[PDB]
């Protein structure tokens, strides 16, 4: 239940209080405050008109690597009953205490029973078939080629590519059953929802404002619809904006029909510079299980050398840049979190942490987590699944970092 | 100290617990849980392995408009002593309880004393001279045309444009003094820092990982540097990525030297679709007080009719799309928060809230705040300053919303 020096300094600055004034208002010793930069937190919070949790330090500090043995993973087993049967077993992989743990599931609904759907969940997930058996994927109430498809297990020789993979779309109910008698496990790996922070806030808005938001977000969310909101925000019309930027009304209209044509882009960037906004968010993204479906063959075809490793791709979606998965056959450094699970061999994960070089040996079902920018490597022979998620550094952070003067210096200052 | 139904449901889903199991684990009545969807929070938190603040509802729910009379603003006056003199008076404008309030400052450092600098602050701010006197802006220890410039007050007839405005850059120390005998006030309006959530997390990383991050963020943060991080993340090299996408190595290299040429854009989008990332964050932003400096003349030149209002622009920066300011001479709906301060007239602010049509009359120095998407209007005659800030909906949210299938339906579901 500690105090974050960065958060404390922010609130002091926001209230425009000195350390002296802050100590005075909160009725605590000034030396305590200078050092912080449980009894202190409550007093500080009331003095700075914030909730104590607005001053709380993270429960986890200096985490590099967390790991979980195959034994501990097996011990985590929890049976799940659905539709009057034993439906799945859930196992949890390595994760920092309190964080969302990746899941392995035994698929136990037999081939002759339609798997009852779940309710869906906001987060998207990569789901991969570990095998050994093929499974059925279900995505709707009615059974159709659109709503019912077999996620194959690899039956051939390059088993480090374990099976088919796809992205479970946000919110749509889904379930799994065995396609035959052969048993099967999956890993379902969820990323953080990037729309979640917005929804959390929009949930607390008045109903009137919420309805207005939905209207502005209804239908086609185009270059034009978004731009018009940007303009109103700056008390501009399309007419005044084009004037301010030195752009002919007709070129603006042309730009908005084709934002990603370098003529569209030139106009929008000119407008963005004149009016104080980032044109990039006005550029088209791909229109919106078939698209992300990645077969065993797909993964075989994507095989490449990656440093000392051989790598193959799981399913991905351009709409979900923060969510990644790869098969790795056995230095690594990623710009956000990794979750790894060993599928073959006795592998050693080595990292450099606060206590110097460290390492753990993990057997199949054994798993690890690595923090953002934690340098690590795998030794041995040699198969691990590499998943990745995390808002930091996520693609939205990348947008902001490119808008930042000397990002490294800014980060250094905060710390 | 309430429970957020959305957060609770998220954690239950994340632990894969039913309502029954959750009630069981937390040892509370299942009817209480079904309804929630202080004694409950502590039990729930321990059951769901989260901190109670991960389940806390927002202190403010259903806020539409907050307001503060000129009298209450004047009552908020706090003198500030710096360099042995009475340096500023601080006044606070309308803001939700606990949020950052916009500030008005009396500038009291006389013309014959160099204004001692502050320490700087992470957030950028629009600062505008309210007059009636010209002031000195200071941005460095040594006095130069780069570090010392007069922020003029409007001495002429269209006083609704109050004076010069500029953006105080992130972190750089600054201060103000009178340029002459005439007194002067400023408004300094801060937006949320969009890099703040990242810094908060990076602060808790091990020193090793933090240093690695700074390396990856050091120097020119280009299309190429960012792409290479995206590739490593997906266990790709430039060679394998170009192969996977069907793109010749030479076209990729050409794309990276000119990402915003529609040939660059075509290559990067192709790569993004094949590899599962958003090409838009790879596109150039403007390279990085002279640039944002907005004179009285500038603001006069930008005058336009905006519905029933006449509007003029304050300073803006394309690097800061969430931060806005306008002079308004007297329906309004914005996609994020507004802070308004009356500079002339007895004006009526009308809004539609949870209790139906509401309104407040405000005189000069009287101020208001409006939530995102709160429909409102000003009546009377007629000058108000319109500021805008807010992460939701901010430009990063706009990037994510364009990556979302049926954003309106997703939002409706969360609520």
Contacts of B288 (CB under 8 A, 6+ apart): A404, A405, A406, B319
Spatial distance between the Cα atoms of B10 and B18, rounded to a whole number of angstroms = 12
Known binding residue B400? Answer is: no
Burial class (CB in 10 A: 0-12, 13-18, 19+), B67: buried
User: CA A101, A104, A109: angle at the middle one, nearest 5?
Assistant: 135
Strand arrangement, sheet containing A103-107: A78-82, A85-92, A103-107, A184-190, A125-132, A165-168
Strand arrangement, sheet containing A376-379: A356-362, A347-353, A376-379
Spatial distance between the Cα atoms of A256 and A279, rounded to a whole number of angstroms = 11
Burial class (CB in 10 A: 0-12, 13-18, 19+), B39: exposed
Cβ–Cβ < 8 Å for B165, B186: no
CA atoms within 13 A on the CB side of A89: 12
Homologous superfamily of A74-197? Jelly Rolls (2.60.120.10)
**Residue A6 is nearest to which of B64, B203, B313, comparing CB atoms?**
B203
DSSP string, A252-313: HHHHHH-TTSHHHHHHHHHHHHHHT--GGGGS------TTT-B-HHHHHHT-EEETTEEEEE
**CATH fold of B2-61+391-415:** 434 Repressor (Amino-terminal Domain) (1.10.260)
- Min Cα separation B47/chain A (Å): 11
DSSP string, A304-341: EEETTEEEEE----TT-TT-EEEEEE--B--SSEEEEE
- Domain ranges in chain B with CATH number 2.60.120.10: 62-72+289-390, 74-197
**Any idea what DSSP says for residue B57?**
P
* C-beta neighbour count of A96 within 10 angstroms: 16
Our measurement of the distance from residue A106's CA atom to the centroid of its chain's CA atoms, rounded to an integer in Å, reads 24
**Any idea what DSSP says for residue B345?**
S
Q: Specify whether domain A198-288 bears CATH 1.10.260.40.
A: yes
SS3 B284: coil
Q: β-strands A85-92, A65-68: how paired?
A: unpaired
Q: Which residues of A are annotated as a binding site for substrate?
A: 16, 90, 118, 168, 174, 188
**Residue B380: left if φ>0, alpha if ψ -120 to 50, beta else—which one?**
left
Asked if A277 lies within 8 A of B321 by C-beta distance, the reply is yes
Chain A residues in contact with B64 (beta carbon < 8 A): 206, 208-209
Chain B residues in contact with A339 (beta carbon < 8 A): none
- Min Cα separation B43/chain A (Å): 15
Cβ–Cβ < 8 Å for B46, B27: no
Spatial distance between the Cα atoms of A124 and A168, rounded to a whole number of angstroms = 6
**Residue B205 is nearest to which of A80, A234, A372, comparing CB atoms?**
A372
- With residue B79 as reference, give the H or E element that holds it: strand B78-82
Spatial distance between the Cα atoms of B234 and B246, rounded to a whole number of angstroms = 17
**Any idea what DSSP says for residue A56?**
B
Cβ–Cβ < 8 Å for B353, A208: yes
Which is nearest to A6 in space by CA: B391, B206, B100, B204? Answer: B204
Contacts of A301 (CB under 8 A, 6+ apart): none
- Domain ranges in chain B with CATH number 1.10.260.40: 2-61+391-415, 198-288
Resolution of this deposited model, Å: 1.9
* C-beta neighbour count of B331 within 10 angstroms: 9
User: CA B386, B390, B391: angle at the middle one, nearest 5?
Assistant: 155
Our measurement of the distance from residue A345's CA atom to the centroid of its chain's CA atoms, rounded to an integer in Å, reads 29
Burial class (CB in 10 A: 0-12, 13-18, 19+), B97: exposed
Look-up of token digits 């209450």: B72
- List the end-to-end C-alpha distance of chain B, in Å, as a whole number: 20
CA dist list (Å): B129 to A138, B116, B174, B339? 62, 19, 15, 17
Q: Which two tokens stand for residue B356?
A: 């139906």
E strands, A146-270, are 148-151, 165-168, 175-178, 184-190
Spatial distance between the Cα atoms of A91 and A106, rounded to a whole number of angstroms = 8
Look-up of token digits 């077993």: A89
Instruction: Give which of A100, A227, A233, A262 to mutate to test B binding, by max B Cβ within 10 Å.
Output: A233
Spatial distance between the Cα atoms of B335 and A216, rounded to a whole number of angstroms = 9
Our measurement of the distance from residue B51's CA atom to the centroid of its chain's CA atoms, rounded to an integer in Å, reads 27
**Any idea what DSSP says for residue B332?**
B
**Residue A206 is nearest to which of B64, B386, B396, comparing CB atoms?**
B64
CA dist list (Å): B338 to B89, B228, B334, B352, B371? 24, 39, 8, 15, 7
DSSP string, A373-394: T--EEEESS-EEEEEEE-STT-
Contacts of B356 (CB under 8 A, 6+ apart): none
Q: Specify whether domain B62-72+289-390 bears CATH 3.40.30.20.
A: no
Spatial distance between the Cα atoms of A8 and A53, rounded to a whole number of angstroms = 11
CA atoms within 13 A on the CB side of B219: 8
Spatial distance between the Cα atoms of A246 and A240, rounded to a whole number of angstroms = 10
Q: Which residues pair with A327 in a beta bridge?
A: A312, A385
Cβ–Cβ < 8 Å for B148, A390: no
- Min Cα separation B210/chain A (Å): 7
- The approach used to solve this structure was X-ray
Burial class (CB in 10 A: 0-12, 13-18, 19+), A142: exposed
Contacts of B316 (CB under 8 A, 6+ apart): A234, A275, A276, A277, B167, B292, B294, B323, B324, B325
User: CA A233, A235, A240: angle at the middle one, nearest 5?
Assistant: 120
Cβ–Cβ < 8 Å for B347, B380: yes
Q: β-strands B383-389, B337-344: how paired?
A: antiparallel
Cβ–Cβ < 8 Å for B154, B130: no
Chain A residues in contact with B333 (beta carbon < 8 A): 212, 232
Cite the DSSP H helix spans in B203-278.
207-217, 223-233, 238-245, 249-257, 262-275
Cite the DSSP H helix spans in A173-206.
196-202
Helix axes B223-233, B262-275, angle to 10 degrees: 10
Residue of chain B nearest A372, judged by CA positions: B209
Asked if A371 lies within 8 A of B209 by C-beta distance, the reply is yes
Nearest-10 Cα torsion for A332, B274, B264, A396: -60
Cβ–Cβ < 8 Å for B370, B376: yes
Contacts of B154 (CB under 8 A, 6+ apart): B131, B161, B162, B163, B296
**Any idea what DSSP says for residue B163?**
B
Chain A residues in contact with B91 (beta carbon < 8 A): none
Known binding residue B363? Answer is: no
Spatial distance between the Cα atoms of A232 and A249, rounded to a whole number of angstroms = 17
* C-beta neighbour count of B38 within 10 angstroms: 8
Which is nearest to B384 in space by CA: B396, B401, B404, B366? Answer: B366
């Amino acid at each position: 239940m500690r105090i974050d020096p960065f958060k404390l300094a922010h609130w002091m600055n926001a209230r425009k209080y000195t350390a002296a004034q802050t100590a005075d208002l909160a009725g605590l010793p000034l030396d305590d405050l200078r050092r912080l930069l449980p009894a202190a937190a409550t007093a500080l919070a009331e003095a700075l008109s914030v909730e104590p949790s607005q001053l709380a330090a993270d429960a986890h500090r200096n985490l590099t690597v967390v790991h979980k043995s195959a034994e501990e993973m097996h011990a985590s087993r929890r049976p799940i009953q659905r539709d009057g049967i034993h439906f799945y077993n859930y196992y949890t992989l390595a994760a920092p205490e309190g964080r969302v743990a990746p899941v392995v599931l035994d698929i136990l609904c037999p081939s002759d029973r339609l798997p009852a759907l779940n309710n869906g969940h906001l987060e998207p997930a990569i789901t991969v078939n570990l095998g050994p058996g093929d499974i059925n994927g279900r995505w709707g109430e009615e059974i159709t080629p659109q709503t019912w498809r077999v996620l194959h297990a690899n039956h051939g020789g390059d088993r480090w590519i374990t099976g088919d993979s796809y992205v479970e779309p946000s919110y749509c109910p889904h379930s799994y059953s065995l396609a035959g008698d052969a048993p099967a496990r999956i890993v379902s790996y969820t990323a953080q929802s990037n729309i979640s922070p917005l929804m959390t806030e929009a949930n607390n808005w008045s109903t009137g404002a919420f309805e207005e938001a939905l209207k502005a977000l209804s239908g086609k969310v185009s270059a034009g619809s978004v731009l018009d909101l940007f303009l109103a925000r700056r008390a501009h019309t399309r007419t005044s904006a084009a004037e301010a930027a030195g752009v002919p009304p007709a070129d603006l209209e042309a730009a908005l029909r084709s934002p990603a044509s370098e003529t569209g882009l030139t106009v929008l960037r000119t407008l963005g510079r004149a009016l104080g906004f980032d044109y990039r968010v006005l550029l088209p993204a791909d229109d919106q299980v078939g698209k992300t479906w990645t077969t065993i063959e797909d993964s075989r075809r994507s095989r490449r050398t990656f440093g000392t490793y051989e790598a193959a791709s799981m399913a991905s979606a351009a709409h979900l840049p923060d969510l990644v998965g790869s098969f790795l056959r056995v230095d690594l450094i990623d710009h956000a979190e990794n979750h790894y699970v060993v599928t073959e061999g006795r592998l050693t994960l080595e990292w450099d942490g606060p206590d110097g070089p460290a390492s753990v040996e993990l057997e199949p079902d054994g798993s690890a987590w690595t923090g953002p920018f934690v340098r690590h490597r795998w030794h041995g022979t040699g198969t691990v699944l590499k998943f990745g998620s995390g808002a930091h550094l996520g693609y939205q952070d990348w947008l902001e970092l490119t808008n930042t003067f000397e990002p490294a210096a800014t980060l250094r200052r905060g710390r």
